[PDB]
Symmetry: C3
Amino acid sequence: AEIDEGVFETTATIDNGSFGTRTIRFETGRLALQAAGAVVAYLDDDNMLLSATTASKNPKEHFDFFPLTVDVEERMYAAGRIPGSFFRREGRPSTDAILTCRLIDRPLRPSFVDGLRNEIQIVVTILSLDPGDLYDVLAINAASASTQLGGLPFSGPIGGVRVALIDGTWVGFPTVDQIERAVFDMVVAGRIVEGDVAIMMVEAEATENVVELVEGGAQAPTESVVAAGLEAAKPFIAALCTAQQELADAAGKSGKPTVDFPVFPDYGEDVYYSVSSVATDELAAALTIGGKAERDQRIDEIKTQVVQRLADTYEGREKEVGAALRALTKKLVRQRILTDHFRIDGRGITDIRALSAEVAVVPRAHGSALFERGETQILGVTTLDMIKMAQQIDSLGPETSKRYMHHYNFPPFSTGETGRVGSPKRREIGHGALAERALVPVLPSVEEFPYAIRQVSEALGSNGSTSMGSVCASTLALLNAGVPLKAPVAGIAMGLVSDDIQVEGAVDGVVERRFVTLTDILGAEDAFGDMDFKVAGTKDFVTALQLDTKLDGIPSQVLAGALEQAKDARLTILEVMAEAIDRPD
Amino acid sequence: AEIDEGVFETTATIDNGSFGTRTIRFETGRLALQAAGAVVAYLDDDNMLLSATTASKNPKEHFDFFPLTVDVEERMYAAGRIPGSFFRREGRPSTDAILTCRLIDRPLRPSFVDGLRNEIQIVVTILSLDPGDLYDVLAINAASASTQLGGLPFSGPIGGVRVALIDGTWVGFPTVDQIERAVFDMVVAGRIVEGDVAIMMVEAEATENVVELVEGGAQAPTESVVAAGLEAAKPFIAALCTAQQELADAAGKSGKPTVDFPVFPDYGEDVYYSVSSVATDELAAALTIGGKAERDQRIDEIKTQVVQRLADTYEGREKEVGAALRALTKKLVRQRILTDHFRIDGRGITDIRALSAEVAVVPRAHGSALFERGETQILGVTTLDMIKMAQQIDSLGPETSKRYMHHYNFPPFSTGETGRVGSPKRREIGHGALAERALVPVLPSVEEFPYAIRQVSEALGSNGSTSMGSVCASTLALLNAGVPLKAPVAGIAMGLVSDDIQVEGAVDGVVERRFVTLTDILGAEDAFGDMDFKVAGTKDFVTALQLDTKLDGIPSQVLAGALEQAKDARLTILEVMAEAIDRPDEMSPYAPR
Amino acid sequence: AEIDEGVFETTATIDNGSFGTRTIRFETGRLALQAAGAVVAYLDDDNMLLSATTASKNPKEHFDFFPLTVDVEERMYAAGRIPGSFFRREGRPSTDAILTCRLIDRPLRPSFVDGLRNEIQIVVTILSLDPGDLYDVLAINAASASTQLGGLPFSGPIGGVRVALIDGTWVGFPTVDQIERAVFDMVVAGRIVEGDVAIMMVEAEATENVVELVEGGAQAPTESVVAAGLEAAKPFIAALCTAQQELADAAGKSGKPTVDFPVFPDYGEDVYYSVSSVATDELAAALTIGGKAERDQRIDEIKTQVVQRLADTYEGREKEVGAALRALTKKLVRQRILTDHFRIDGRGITDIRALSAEVAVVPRAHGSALFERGETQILGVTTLDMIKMAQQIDSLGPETSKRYMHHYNFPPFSTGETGRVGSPKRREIGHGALAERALVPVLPSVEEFPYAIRQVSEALGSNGSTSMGSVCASTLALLNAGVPLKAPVAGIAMGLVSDDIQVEGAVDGVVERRFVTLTDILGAEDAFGDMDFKVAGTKDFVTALQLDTKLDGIPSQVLAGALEQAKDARLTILEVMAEAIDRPDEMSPYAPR
RNA sequence: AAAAAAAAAAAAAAA
Ligand SMILES: O=C(NC1(C(=O)O)CCCC1)c1ccc(-c2ccc(NC(=O)c3nc(-c4ccccc4)oc3C(F)(F)F)cc2)cc1
Ligand SMILES: O=C(NC1(C(=O)O)CCCC1)c1ccc(-c2ccc(NC(=O)c3nc(-c4ccccc4)oc3C(F)(F)F)cc2)cc1
Ligand SMILES: O=C(NC1(C(=O)O)CCCC1)c1ccc(-c2ccc(NC(=O)c3nc(-c4ccccc4)oc3C(F)(F)F)cc2)cc1
């Protein structure tokens, strides 16, 4: 809709029945005209933000990864007050801004074509905010829209939404007041594939009032309820994607990429063919070696031997042969899993690594615990203080104080490396937040337990799924310190490997798609797998959920099976945790 | 004067008649003897500071620019107080220190010979400060003197001064009490050329009491008054330069530089000759397109073809080819302007770009505005709060609190680039301060309007003179929020192109300097021009002023014409702004009372 | 002892007679199993910490030094409370953490084989702390143990201990309450060589109550008392080293280094041989030049000549020839000192450089002073304020407030360099701490002098031992401000060069080892010397001491002589600076009352 | 981390 000369606008409607209806408006052609693409987004003519996308002129090939940057700028005048810091100006980004950056980055990063090396930056500035609303999902939609309008090698629009479960109804774009009446809150992002919605990213939690609401007659959030919520999110995502596509079509764009960006593939076809022909049997034999150290040294000497010949023939190109060896090893591992259902460490597909839990490991600490799963080792420590030591928060969001604080540390020596020790990175902030929200729903009220609580997790050894280990360790340490939890909580990380491998028959035209679900995946299995998701909760319902995928469709039965498998593992871990301690000390 | 063996001293006198006399003393040969040059500067026996200059042993020829760095270190013991921070120690530099660094850097940077690639650093430490005095101009003088004594490829001494207009007299080096009785105060820096003072840098503002003083019978600071003030600062600059030169002569130095520094020109002469002979006609034709996208595409194609062919011929030397192409383009643009009075975008020499102004653009904002000039686009937002949210200042200078705050932001996408988004840089601080001082003299008193005020400017699009756009946007947004200003304010930027071109005749000896003044310059005209002169004010008098120039002298009539043209442009912009809003609105329901 | 499958532990006992006995326990095989080495250390089953050591897979040859890194992580839950900062989380390291990092780094860094280029990182995390205990020395032991256990090219275990002098007994690992009754406190680190303890690192101070304790009848800490304290620490170090070695043997390791680390020597044998054969006599004569400027000019001429001669022959290698020339020049200077007792500047073995002291240099400062020793030049400034301006400290240690603060600044221009100016480095923190502790024992009580005191030292020129110069300047400036000190304090830096050379005779296999002690060493002498130590105090006893060495044994007579020589120099300097001021002045009118 | 050796329009990961 051309409201003005050069200005275009589109609208999408979210109908929540008796809970109301909301409108989202996208506008382009008026602000920030020197960027590659720019969009202004409105929610209910009271929430307003701007998103701009640009790209660098020259490729940059000293890097070996795709350089993408996302930034969120929260302006205090959007809340109508002056910043409280000593210099009266906005400083480093807050935790909410970092979490929003991660939410945008996770689904968009894999949507670009492989091998790109130009810098790409997305900046989202918050301009106006209603006190009872949340801006993160709106920001996701705006970032997608500006990237789409920028004429870059980007795979279609991406839509994001939040759904909350209130009195048996899934409500889209709920307010803070409505969230206070819900039992479960979930952010979902996806895209449209051949007329159907494919889920890409999920982040969900249980609310802080869930136990009381369930005692009043509400339905608890079990696995089937979560699946139903995922199904209910799809129509909203479809509507948002349609609005973005209409905006792109109206303001030209569509085709005519004009500027063409080069691509830098990891390796050439001939190098890969030679590497396969020379090392297929060596790698196949090596992967059958039980143990860790001997297998690692066998693989290392295979690498040094193979690179000693092909590099000389291919005129001093060792990175290409290394990449080809990585690709061949990954393919072999996937094929072995798909055919024999045999994992690299020898486990079955439903097996968990060796578990152990212990309490009272730091002499003067108020509470402490040590939790081990395979080579993953987490130490948790809890301290208690007067209620005045709760954190005071000054930001755009509605939160003003923080009674329970959780901090997560990941030192380089946990993986045998060296590196800078200093401020936490974005990934540490994200992992800490996930564990914190996993624990929030099981906590006594201020009236019955008037203390400020700080929990610290330190990853002393890491081989995959450190967040779930921190969840378990925090439950153990809180019990050891005498906090009266409503119920213990545990978590697990699951993986999925899918492929269209041949089935019983011939002709090679009867291939059917197959899926395999893996319990308690290692780091390598995450790197080589097709989907990974983490589940935490009690023995009655889920408290936290996180999922990332890139497949173009997942049958419902596969997801139901995966959720049930995760629940079984969670119960098995809860039994071992209870053996160490089963009531507050 | 050798007061002690190896120690030399020189003095300069500033005579203000019935307002008093002041003395400035330079000393060398006693402190910091391992630096390349070092000087101690005194003002009235009570203000004392130290300046030191050093240079790196080896060059960095892979750099594309001259790496000069300036640092100002404020010590709290200069005021007899312990720092108030949690660790009781000086931390990151304050806004005053950053502004002083910019003041030193602007005139000194062009004074070095081009092509230099050694690192040069200047550090100024404040040792003792009288509560009623300012140290910035003294610092400019000391930095110049230490660099002059360091035996570097530096062009002559530079002198800097402050002048304030009190009862029709321009007083040099005024105190805080004297400044609060003035209507205008201005900092000027220059050098001596063929026995006359050439002005290089200017920074001026009207005071916060100007309206009340003018109502009481004082003369308002119009254009002619400001020009007279510029003329009155020259004798002081000459005296300061003479004192510095005498100090340099006394302590040896002067000749025999001893250390020789290499130079790295951007391109060779043969490369320039080839580029010219291959591309002159193509470039001349391309500049006639005058339609941006087509012109940009044509220039890019010409550049690609030339670099390809000349890299084939010269075996992979592309940087010099690019530099030569840029220099040739600059020469053609300047010649077109000087001969035919044609600009890049097809404007006359006095024309302003298309203007537009709008208010109430952010829904839950106390006031907001959008201001556009051709391709520069500024968004301004106002917020109001209780008087206790005023900024508390704990610096070395006399200021203790700030009722009105202005912050300026310049994101990378404003010009289509990618870069880091973080803490503001020094240039952002400078632009913000310039826009802030243009509005102070018009704000209402705290008794009438008891609120703290914060203004934010965001440069959504940048193609030249973003600070003047910030001034206009702040006026609009403040009016939209219900602040009762005394008068609206607006601003503009001006440019210059000059050279020695033979007048109609012969003998090649009648060559004389010729000047052309441009209104509302583009970014490219600033890059290829000879100066950048920003003027802001009301319809009655000027409120803020900033100038930097690289030439060796501008005739007074040229500046007078520039000021008059700027005033005409300002009036046009004010009329356009008033058409959009001409009186304060009602206060927003979301604001406090 | 294998308490559990794969878990080993060992114990060391420390017996203080009637003052009690303590135990230190080392454990491995349980925590942090992916690091190269990891150890847990316990003190009295109430203090607990963890240390981990890792190494990078590949070397890096573009560095010209050994990249070792040490980090100390203080966790606030070890004290059982939530951090007090706005974000409720631990931020940048505190001063105590930095000092502990340097205490670990000083003895361990020279203990690795030269030429190593892999990254080595050590991280020590504090897990549990008793309120009346100190964790720094326990951390030193743990870092040594984890490095030893990692199978790296590391020369044997290193032990560290603290001894405090109480009622004539040297107590090991004292508590805070016990230190409150001591006159002297000393941290010592060493290692076992051919069955005897060789001292490597010392850092010592006098307590804040020393004057009153000595008035009460205790013995003052003179030079002989400090020597006795150094002797009393050896058995504890031996026991700690033995426990570490037993732990290493029990858990395998010992042999089988497995991982081989390449080494990158500075120069080859042939390059050194040619450089010597072509430059021996040419450099020998240049060192006889008494003029520093002529000396360095000739030296750089010779370097350029040798470089341009030998670059062609060795296919171009400037770094190797430069390194060989450095080794040759250092060897020649050492031989000259050992044989003729001559120094670079022609001084005698006990001579001090020219001294000068002056007060009242900054006009408005409460007190100020300028101190010069040869080419070293320090400016000191004092500030006084209300007692509420004392620093408030929030950390693990028992300290909670800081009445006297000392800050030390080392700008790049003090050596004629360019560099970043801003937050201080670790070395500045260390030097400031040393000067602060040197002054603490001479200070009036709060009841007698109710003020907060801030002292700032600025190194305007540096050529060697700026920290002792800071001590002298602080005494002068404090007297000038009117602070009633109990006695003045001065300091000096000393060097020692040792070697085994032939004695008058024949056979050439009867060489004997000799030592030469140097007073007030230059920077070059420190670079080319074998040991350096700094001593400060009054005319009656020592207040601070710092020592670093790598020799495998020092006779007691040599050390006694060195201490006496330092005392003589200190008395001479005190006499010189009493001429400038001998009693406190009247308080400045600008200071509060 | 060891050591004396800013000017201009031009973050992802176990690694
Ligand atoms: O700990 C973690 N924690 C995190 C968590 O989730 O919380 C913390 C925050 C996020 C992660 C983590 C730990 C380890 C990994 C990992 C991934 C891949 C490989 N890669 C191989 O391991 C390999 N490389 C080869 C090969 C190499 C060269 C030539 C030929 C082959 O072969 C192989 C072979 F199959 F043998 F196993 C190792 C480790 C990831 C995550
Ligand atoms: O806003 C601005 N600054 C600030 C302000 O507020 O003021 C904002 C924040 C602080 C200050 C600003 C914006 C843009 C510019 C700019 C300048 C020059 C060019 N350069 C060409 O534009 C060009 N380059 C060529 C050429 C190049 C190589 C080879 C051959 C030809 O030709 C040409 C041709 F003349 F055509 F136009 C572009 C943009 C400057 C300032
Ligand atoms: O100021 C200081 N302050 C500090 C303090 O302690 O507080 C502050 C914090 C720690 C230090 C300091 C000042 C100077 C040094 C230093 C060290 C070595 C050399 N090096 C030569 O000095 C030399 N180099 C040559 C030569 C070179 C190349 C080719 C051939 C010859 O010859 C020679 C010859 F020995 F003769 F004198 C110079 C200065 C150290 C510290």
